[PDB]
Amino acid sequence: IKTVLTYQLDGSNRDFNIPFEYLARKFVVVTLIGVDRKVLTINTDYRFATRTTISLTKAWGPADGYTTIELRRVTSTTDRLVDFTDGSILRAYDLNVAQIQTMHVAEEARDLTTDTIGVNNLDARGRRIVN
Amino acid sequence: KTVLTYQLDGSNRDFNIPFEYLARKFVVVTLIGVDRKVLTINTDYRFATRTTISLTKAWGPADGYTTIELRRVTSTTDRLVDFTDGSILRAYDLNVAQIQTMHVAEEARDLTTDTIGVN
Amino acid sequence: NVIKTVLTYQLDGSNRDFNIPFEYLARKFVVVTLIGVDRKVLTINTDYRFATRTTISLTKAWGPADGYTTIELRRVTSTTDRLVDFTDGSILRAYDLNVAQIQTMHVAEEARDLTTDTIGVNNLDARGRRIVNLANAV
């Protein structure tokens, strides 16, 4: 509740906030869904202004073709953050962030469910494909 | 089977539940297709034998409520266990820690399979 | 976006040998299947060696004529049978806490991956399934 959003963007607005908690600087991925998908890059174009608002250096509008930013919290399965070596004491904090991050993936699965088809009582995709 | 549907005759209340839960407020239980009525625990429903919802008393099916769809919703924010500096671990705990985060996963796949399905 | 643990290689005539990039925890957690008229599942110790750590030497040389168009494989981690279970000590090992955290990292990932895998946004909606019945043309 809720990882994936889309805002609304028009030009000269560049400061958009994150509702979730991110747990690592790279886990936010920021894509102007636009007409077409475009992934944005951690320093070139958006900087985290206050750890909870994403500033934008370039203030994109609909007029160069793009609405809107979709920011999900993609959490990698391979880049695990907590590794237990031979001791190397277990702080409780180590065991905490290990069970914290794996819940973060599991909840990201529950906001994947809204962004495929949906039943309206089915979607405005231009294509469905390979049959 | 993290979510199941239960329609039944009226003034009966002794539903059995499997999935199996961790906290009693994870079971959310609903009233159906005319409305989306979500009833609360202590105004309405206890659990009696820790596997039955024993409901409240009647409702069914007559008030447009045909009928109950109880389900798991585990909260992903309120972790049941916070590990602290020792404050020693119990082996029950080290399991239940990883047990809960596997249950969001079993929850998450199954409501996606209810739209267009796999099989 | 993007599927990390289900993958569909082009079977492409006689090619015996494909790679598996994701971090499968045990041998039996990878199920390989055959696509193209059927959904053929093929058992390990006879029909295909694990070539190496990361490679499936499939024996032999299926498709596409004589039936199957794409070898695909996915992870299936058992979400019930946990792999190391902690009892009273029984000292905590680095291997024990990791594999326990490794496994539940997969089950949440295998969930999130499976949810795109059914019908979901291609990087438009996708997959080579039959989309069995919708029952009316309007």
Side-chain angles (χ1 to χ4, degrees):
Chain A
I1 301 170
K2 185 178 180 180
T3 69
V4 181
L5 41 82
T6 60
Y7 284 136
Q8 191 272 330
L9 66 87
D10 188 74
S12 67
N13 191 1
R14 66 175 74 251
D15 291 331
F16 292 159
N17 60 5
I18 53 95
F20 58 91
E21 68 273 17
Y22 63 92
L23 186 66
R25 183 65 58 87
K26 66 180 73 65
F27 288 174
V28 181
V29 65
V30 175
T31 62
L32 273 68
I33 195 169
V35 173
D36 293 330
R37 297 290 291 161
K38 185 175 180 180
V39 179
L40 282 292
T41 304
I42 301 171
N43 199 4
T44 56
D45 53 21
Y46 65 92
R47 62 177 180 89
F48 291 175
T50 182
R51 182 263 180 89
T52 189
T53 68
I54 64 166
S55 179
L56 301 175
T57 67
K58 187 67 173 174
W60 294 268
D64 60 357
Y66 291 156
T67 56
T68 315
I69 293 174
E70 181 179 1
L71 60 93
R72 68 182 62 246
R73 55 182 308 276
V74 64
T75 304
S76 58
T77 184
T78 62
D79 186 355
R80 294 179 294 110
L81 182 61
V82 179
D83 291 332
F84 293 101
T85 65
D86 291 331
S88 77
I89 60 171
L90 61 88
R91 294 178 179 88
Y93 182 74
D94 291 332
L95 291 169
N96 283 319
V97 179
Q99 75 185 347
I100 289 162
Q101 185 183 3
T102 187
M103 295 177 75
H104 284 300
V105 173
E107 190 265 330
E108 179 68 30
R110 286 183 298 174
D111 290 333
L112 201 149
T113 190
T114 185
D115 292 331
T116 186
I117 53 99
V119 60
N120 61 3
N121 193 359
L122 275 301
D123 191 74
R125 295 294 90 194
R127 297 292 179 91
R128 187 181 60 83
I129 53 108
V130 69
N131 75 13
Chain B
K1 72 279 191 186
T2 180
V3 185
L4 31 79
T5 61
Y6 280 152
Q7 62 89 28
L8 82 158
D9 292 331
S11 68
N12 190 0
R13 65 178 181 177
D14 292 330
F15 291 109
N16 190 0
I17 66 169
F19 56 102
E20 59 89 18
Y21 62 89
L22 272 299
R24 292 166 66 84
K25 65 182 292 294
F26 289 164
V27 175
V28 65
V29 57
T30 191
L31 279 69
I32 199 60
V34 173
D35 291 330
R36 298 291 183 185
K37 184 175 178 181
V38 175
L39 78 168
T40 62
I41 294 99
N42 297 331
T43 63
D44 291 330
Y45 64 97
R46 54 93 51 88
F47 300 89
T49 62
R50 61 88 56 82
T51 187
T52 60
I53 60 112
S54 296
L55 190 154
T56 73
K57 188 48 73 70
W59 288 274
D63 293 330
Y65 292 150
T66 60
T67 320
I68 289 164
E69 185 180 359
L70 61 92
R71 60 180 297 163
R72 173 173 70 241
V73 174
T74 48
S75 64
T76 186
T77 62
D78 186 74
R79 293 185 289 113
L80 272 74
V81 60
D82 294 333
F83 292 161
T84 59
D85 291 331
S87 81
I88 60 102
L89 297 170
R90 63 183 181 178
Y92 181 75
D93 194 4
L94 292 174
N95 291 319
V96 169
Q98 70 183 350
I99 292 299
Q100 179 181 0
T101 180
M102 293 176 78
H103 289 177
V104 183
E106 185 179 0
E107 180 69 31
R109 58 91 52 84
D110 187 74
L111 81 159
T112 61
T113 58
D114 291 332
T115 61
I116 306 300
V118 182
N119 198 359
Chain C
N1 296 115
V2 179
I3 297 101
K4 299 290 184 178
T5 193
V6 178
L7 56 88
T8 64
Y9 290 159
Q10 183 65 42
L11 187 153
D12 190 72
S14 179
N15 191 0
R16 294 168 183 267
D17 191 76
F18 292 165
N19 60 2
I20 58 179
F22 61 90
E23 54 175 9
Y24 66 98
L25 199 149
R27 292 182 185 272
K28 68 185 179 68
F29 289 166
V30 174
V31 63
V32 183
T33 69
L34 274 293
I35 306 301
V37 176
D38 291 331
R39 181 65 65 174
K40 185 257 180 66
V41 182
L42 71 174
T43 62
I44 296 99
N45 290 318
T46 62
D47 190 81
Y48 65 98
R49 287 179 67 252
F50 290 100
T52 60
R53 184 62 59 90
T54 183
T55 305
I56 46 107
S57 69
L58 293 164
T59 63
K60 66 181 186 180
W62 292 268
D66 73 2
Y68 295 103
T69 189
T70 58
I71 291 149
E72 66 92 13
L73 52 98
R74 61 180 296 164
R75 192 177 66 201
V76 175
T77 56
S78 66
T79 185
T80 62
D81 184 75
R82 288 184 289 124
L83 276 84
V84 59
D85 305 340
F86 293 103
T87 62
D88 290 329
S90 80
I91 52 103
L92 296 175
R93 292 183 184 272
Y95 182 78
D96 290 331
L97 291 178
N98 287 318
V99 173
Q101 191 277 129
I102 302 303
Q103 184 54 251
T104 182
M105 190 64 200
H106 295 307
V107 175
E109 181 68 29
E110 180 67 37
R112 184 178 69 188
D113 189 83
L114 188 150
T115 55
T116 307
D117 185 74
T118 67
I119 185 164
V121 176
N122 193 359
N123 56 9
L124 74 164
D125 292 331
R127 188 60 70 178
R129 277 76 178 264
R130 294 179 63 88
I131 295 169
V132 178
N133 56 5
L134 58 89
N136 194 0
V138 176

